[PDB]
């Protein structure tokens with residue numbers, strides 16, 4: 082409304098069970114943390130599917146894997162449906178999914194971190210290798226927003242005063258620098274690219 | 287509205303002339319920067335007057351000077367009328383007062399920084415000795431808010447999810463550490479306390 086208004090950031094606490102899951106993920110040892118990439122690519126593929134199916138009723142859909150050695154970040158990007166402010170607030174922190182508790186119960190009953198996907202909480206596997214995660218998204222029905230969390234009990238929602246889609250940036254943990262290496266990413270992408278219908282472009286830089 | 291909502295910060299650009307004045311104040315040499323204290327005490331006294339006069343139609347009103355050697359800050363506090371969010375946004379950055387340009391014109395015509403008070407912009411003299419200023423206020427008609435600026439072209443407005451009044455905290459410049467000394471403050475307060483009707487309490491700490 083104000084001419085001089087530049088932007089806004091809102092802080093939200095995580096729903097109790099989401100907070101527990103994030104602590105369990107970021108501050109607990111697991112043997113194969115590399116499963117995070119399969120989860121992010123799978124989410125990107127689902128976002129591309131949502132807009133592709135919307136086209137039946139109501140451009141090349143693709144997924145990009147962008148390592149950045151200088152800022153020590155790994156980004157998974159898509160030109161899928163995108164998320165509104167409400168989608169980010171409601172589905173990425175404040176409303177508990179049945180899968181949050183159910184995944185923690187499955188791990189407790191001897192399950193594996195690779196099972197995360199069936200519980201609708203696979204996004205949070207990013208915290209196996211990252212100490213901070215940034216979600217920048219644009220849906221056709223809303224302005225673009227930036228979600229951010231360092232798994233400290235809260236997340237932020239910031240305005241951007243972007244083309245349709247989502248960019249997920251992972252600030253990597255000191256000992257998880259192997260996911261910046263092009264050879265390592267090419268291998269990881271090939272390991273599960275067999276069942277992704279969309280093109281997965283690794284940006285060499 | 288949301289149960290998990292914690293707080294919000296909004297960024298605003300300064301109105302062009304306010305931005306010019308702040309650059310002129312913070313990044314220009316003046317011989318007697320000590321005039322800032324007289325200005326802050328005078329503003330506090332005016333805020334106490336506004337509520338005292340409101341009492342005629344519709345507690346001890348006093349002013350406190352709080353030095354803090356550890357955080358390198360000087361605070362001027364009052365239990366005056368206080369400011370709403372709108373008061374902070376409109377009168378502390380986005381709406382140009384006629385006094386903004388007129389004070390810069392008076393300095394240009396040979397005026398002195400001590401004249402600032404007659405132009406309704408005396409608050410900005412805080413930047414003669416401070417690199418950052420924080421305004422925390424509570425008015426009876428609104429929740430309490432925090433205004434903040436480092437004279438970088440913008441200011442912030444942050445929610446506090448406080449008793450009626452205002453607290454102005456100055457983060458002092460490296461060479462302006464003399465305004466933390468109790469002896470120096472006692473002198474400065476005495477220099478103009480003759481015309482302030484309210485009690486001025488220096489908190490020794």
Ligand SMILES: CO[C@H]1/C=C\C=C(/C)C(=O)NC2=CC(=O)C(NCCCN(C)C)=C(C[C@@H](C)C[C@H](OC)[C@H](O)[C@@H](C)/C=C(\C)[C@@H]1OC(N)=O)C2=O
Nearest residue numbers: 124125127128131159161162168172201202203204205247
């Ligand atoms: C940031 O990553 C994603 C956002 C949340 C991710 C969460 C918490 C997670 O860990 N897993 C989920 C994976 C899903 O695939 C999925 N979709 C339903 C599939 C049915 N089963 C299989 C779940 C949901 C339900 C719900 C959140 C979906 C979304 O808001 C309604 C959007 O419709 C969807 C298009 C946005 C995304 C998939 C985001 O990815 C990108 N790149 O956009 C999940 O919960």
Ligand SMILES: CO[C@H]1/C=C\C=C(/C)C(=O)NC2=CC(=O)C(NCCCN(C)C)=C(C[C@@H](C)C[C@H](OC)[C@H](O)[C@@H](C)/C=C(\C)[C@@H]1OC(N)=O)C2=O
Nearest residue numbers: 329330332333336364366367373377406407408409410452
């Ligand atoms: C943060 O400090 C103050 C806020 C802004 C200060 C500005 C920009 C400044 O540099 N100088 C001003 C000094 C004034 O005295 C003054 N009041 C009218 C007196 C008539 N002439 C003499 C001006 C105004 C007009 C207007 C802003 C007033 C306020 O919003 C309507 C409130 O009524 C008032 C009670 C709040 C304060 C005085 C604040 O202090 C404390 N401690 O609360 C000034 O502009």
